[PDB]
């Protein structure tokens, strides 16, 4: 992944 | 209230190791990516590492690649940074920072929002040394009008901090304790000064109380006028 | 690496003024720019995300604009709680920060009080000599301290240290320490400290002769 992509959970 | 605190910092010699930890509160730790960011002596901020929410991906800055490892315990809600082969350039305050807390997916790029309290890391080949406290005596070359100036030079100590009081804390008005500067020897030097009435230089006593706890060095130095 | 640059590095302002800080990027970062506020001893705080979006609870006296390579933070009316260092950060390719812009409190010009201290006899018995020149309570921060030893301009043997702006009177204080060996200290007679500040009519010189 791009390091600046979403690093958080998908609810 | 989203809040974080980093800890684990200390003073190590080049090539040694250090583990930093970060405690959180007020948010679900396992739901957000976490950053490590540091701030060098020149107040410059530089990113160190990021870890995904589930620990599936980790990215590192080129300066720390191969020597640092970022990890997380999503059950104890803790962020870790294990460092080995430390360099003098790694001397900084290390903060933990949460990635921007959006759980929508609408954006394509993500930064940081909440930063925790930092922990100080000092990497230096110098060894622990107590300070030499020399009096900066008042005289005519230090008396402008009715205001005279006196102080104490606190020289050749490592590491920081040194604490300086005056008259065991009884003298606080007009006291300037300057920031420590790093000498070429790898040791620090510092001066603390105070302005007093010149008419009280033969009637009052002035002692500078230096305490360097890393070396168990408490020093009281009377400053007599020339 | 996308390089971030801020201007100015220091900004003198008063309460109630309209303050503007600029951030430039070596490459187009679209609108992925963030403004952080950091007060001394504390961690940075996020004020503006996505170039223009204010965070919850941020006062509406803060505003941000720009896209591509030029961005701007504007404080419409500087309040006492706004005197701090402000950093910009791009988050397009990794995360890189600007060097910071320090917003300081402007006050009237205050000329420094120059004091000089010859090295103590105790330090000389240890083989080193330190002469300290003290500039107490002055504004603005810019001052020049030149060391002269027997009419010779010194270079590379002095270290300066400046305090933060004082919380009561908003002044700065400065110490310049000349460090020499005891042998080199005993080869010269006159040691002078020349101070140039915009609050002084003419530069001030505090001199002492070794053994006086």
Author numbering:
A (entry chain P): 2 to 12
B (entry chain H): 1 to 52, 52A, 53 to 82, 82A, 82B, 82C, 83 to 100, 100A, ...
C (entry chain L): 1 to 94, 96 to 213
Could you share sentences copied from the article?
IGHV3-33-encoded antibodies are prevalent in the human humoral response against the Plasmodium falciparum circumsporozoite protein (PfCSP). As the most abundant surface protein expressed by Pf sporozoites and with essential roles in parasite development and invasion, Pf circumsporozoite protein (PfCSP) is a major target for biomedical interventions. PfCSP is composed of three domains: an N-terminal domain that undergoes proteolytic cleavage prior to hepatocyte invasion; a polymorphic, T cell epitope-containing C-terminal domain; and a conserved central region largely composed of consecutive major NANP repeat motifs. In total, 22 antibody fragment (Fab)-antigen complex structures were solved at 1.54- to 2.95-Å resolution to gain insights into whether differences in potency are associated with different features of PfCSP repeat recognition.
The 10 mAbs that exhibited high affinity for the major repeat and varying degrees of cross-reactivity induced two distinct conformations in the antigen. Comparison of the 1210- and MGG4-like binding modes revealed that the N-core conformation was largely dictated by the HCDR3. All seven 1210-like mAbs contained a bulky Lys or Tyr residue six positions from the end of the HCDR3 (termed here position HCDR3(-6)) that directly occluded the MGG4-like conformation through steric hindrance. The presence of an HCDR3(-6) Lys/Tyr appeared to correlate with IGHJ gene usage because all seven 1210-like mAbs were encoded by IGHJ6∗02, where Tyr is the GL-encoded HCDR3(-6) residue40. For five of the seven 1210-like mAbs (Ky15.2, Ky15.3, Ky15.5, Ky15.7, and Ky15.8), this position was occupied by a Lys residue that formed a salt bridge with the Asp at the beginning of the N-core when DPNA was bound in this site. Ky15.10 and Ky315 had lower binding affinities to junctional peptides KQPA and NPDP compared with the five 1210-like mAbs with an HCDR3(-6) Lys residue. This suggests that the Lys residue facilitates high-affinity binding to junctional epitopes where DPNA is present in the N-core, which aligns with the register by which the 1210-like mAbs bind KQPA and NPDP. We also noted that 1210-like mAbs bind peptides derived from the PfCSP junction (KQPA and NPDP) with a preferred register that positions the major NANP repeat in the center of the epitope between the N- and C-core motifs. Between seven 1210-like mAbs and three MGG4-like mAbs, we observed that the 1210-like mAbs exhibited significantly greater inhibition of parasite liver burden than the MGG4-like mAbs.
